């Protein structure tokens, strides 16, 4: 009779909006030739076949039209980025991509619970509260280090063997993505030739080099240096048509920037990878103890907490609770 009916406004979308409103995305010069895609909030399906030709155009679409939880752009260069049929689009080159296969590399801990009763469910729905269960995957800094290794080795093979000039970027969540902005006859490498490079970098056909000095020049030295192949997801590399999550965008699963690492050594996995400032009141769904952004956090179901926005947004997008308010 006196029950107040008021819906909690999504602050997360606010944060993102504010971010994208002033963020300066790392965009290719051949912007007009690339198809942009985006996964919106509350929608599992992508909003593809977009095509802009100015940072501003892109900015406005995001802040005004559709807000991206995840935002990318095709690696491939087209003549009609907006076309719907591959024949009409007209592919004419694609960038060279590599991505540390974090799924294979780390093996992280996941949990399935019911946001309501905060209990562990095995099924996707909670019979008791008739609600869909959630899943939490604890991403550790031990794992980020593993990826940073492979990225190191990758940049080596890339610069040392192929004499290329790679650019490293934090995946924004679980790992890294290395990319070569090759426009030469390179950009035209067929998927099969690409698959060649992929297997090379993965140390597939590569033999061991029992004698070999650590100073050999190629797999010869490398093998004798302990390195036996980089752990990448070939599919990313062999795929001529692929979506490059735009550098400087926020990763929908962490709220962390897709930052570019210039010195693999300096890279630290902090809450510093989040552009957000203030503080946020967080309401945990469950009582849990886990590492978050390289620090253990104890959470009790129900007990509000006043944490930094960074962790706040993070924990929220990771399904551990909700960001009830901001300060």
Contact positions toward Zn ion, by CB under 5 A?
114, 116-117, 126, 128-129
101 is catalytic: yes
Indicate which residue of 233, 239, 265, 266 is catalytic. Answer: 233
Closer CB to other proteins, 138 or 199, in the complex: 199
Nearest distance from C-beta of residue 93 to other proteins, angstroms? 13
How many helical (H) and strand (E) elements, i.e. helices and strands, does the chain have?
9, 17
232 and 98 in contact (C-beta within 8 Å)? yes
Nearest distance from C-beta of residue 200 to other proteins, angstroms? 5
- Return all residues near 38 (Cβ < 8 A) that are at least 6 apart: 46, 47, 50, 62, 66, 68, 70, 71, 72
Segments in the chain forming alpha helices (H): 11-22, 55-60, 86-89, 102-105, 141-156, 191-201, 219-223, 234-238, 309-317
Residue of 58, 65, 60, 59 lying closest to 40 (CA atoms): 65
Backbone angles phi, psi at 237, to 5 degrees: -80, -45
Nearest distance from C-beta of residue 210 to other proteins, angstroms? 4
**How is 166-177 classified by DSSP, letter by letter?**
-EEEE-SSSSEE
Nearest distance from C-beta of residue 261 to other proteins, angstroms? 23
Stretch that binds other proteins, among 210-218, 249-257, 286-294, 316-324 (CB under 8 A): 210-218
Q: Determine if residue 161 is labeled as part of a ligand binding site.
A: no
Residues 155-184 as x/- pattern, contact with other proteins by CB under 8 A: -----xxxxx-------------------x
Q: How far is CA 51 from CA 37, 179, 285, in A?
A: 9, 22, 39
- Return all residues near 41 (Cβ < 8 A) that are at least 6 apart: 10, 12, 13, 67, 69
73 and 179 in contact (C-beta within 8 Å)? no
Q: Determine if residue 143 is labeled as part of a ligand binding site.
A: no
Does position 204 bind other proteins by CB under 8 A? yes
Q: Determine if residue 182 is labeled as part of a ligand binding site.
A: no
265 is catalytic: no
268 binds, among other proteins, Zn ion, none (CB under 5 to 8 A by kind): none
Closer CB to other proteins, 30 or 190, in the complex: 190
Cβ-based neighbour number of residue 313 at 10 Å? 27
Does position 213 bind other proteins by CB under 8 A? yes
160 is catalytic: no
114 binds, among other proteins, Zn ion, none (CB under 5 to 8 A by kind): Zn ion
Nearest distance from C-beta of residue 324 to Zn ion, angstroms? 20
Question: Residues with catalytic annotation?
Answer: 99, 101, 233
Binding residues for Zn(2+): 114, 117, 126, 129
Judged by the rule CB under 8 A, the positions of this chain that interact with other proteins are: 160-164, 184-186, 189, 192-193, 196-197, 199-200, 203-207, 209-213, 216-221
């Amino acid at each position: 009779t006196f029950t107040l009916h008021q819906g909690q406004t999504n602050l997360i979308k606010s944060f993102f909006r504010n971010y994208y409103l002033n963020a300066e995305l790392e965009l290719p010069k051949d912007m007009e030739l690339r198809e942009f895609a985006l996964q919106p909030f509350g929608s599992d399906t992508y909003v593809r076949h977009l095509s802009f030709s100015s940072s501003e155009e892109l900015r406005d679409y995001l802040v005004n039209r559709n807000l991206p939880l995840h935002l990318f752009y095709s690696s491939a260069r087209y003549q009609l980025p907006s076309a719907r049929n591959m024949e009409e689009k007209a592919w004419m080159g694609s960038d060279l991509l590599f991505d540390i296969d974090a799924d294979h590399l780390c093996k992280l801990r996941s949990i399935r619970f019911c946001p309501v009763c905060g209990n562990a469910v095995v099924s996707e729905k909670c019979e008791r509260d008739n609600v869909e269960t959630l899943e939490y995957v604890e991403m550790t800094s031990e794992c980020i280090k593993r990826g940073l290794e492979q990225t190191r080795n990758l940049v080596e093979i890339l610069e040392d063997d192929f004499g290329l000039k790679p650019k490293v970027y934090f995946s924004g969540n679980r790992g890294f993505h290395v990319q070569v902005d090759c426009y030469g006859n390179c950009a035209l490498l067929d998927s099969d030739e690409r698959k060649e490079i992929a297997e090379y970098v993965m140390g597939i056909g590569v033999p061991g080099y029992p004698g070999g000095s650590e100073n050999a020049p190629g797999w010869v030295g490398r093998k004798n240096r302990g390195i036996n192949g980089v752990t990448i997801d070939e599919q990313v590399t062999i795929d001529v048509k692929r979506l490059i999550r735009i550098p400087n965008s926020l990763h929908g699963k962490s709220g962390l920037i897709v930052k570019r690492v210039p010195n693999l050594d300096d890279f630290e996995f902090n809450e510093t990878l989040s552009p957000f400032t203030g503080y946020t009141i967080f309401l945990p769904y469950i009582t849990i103890e886990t590492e978050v952004l390289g620090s253990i956090i104890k959470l009790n179901r129900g007990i509000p907490i006043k944490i930094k926005s960074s962790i706040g947004i993070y924990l929220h997008l990771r399904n551990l609770g909700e960001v009830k308010a901001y300060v």
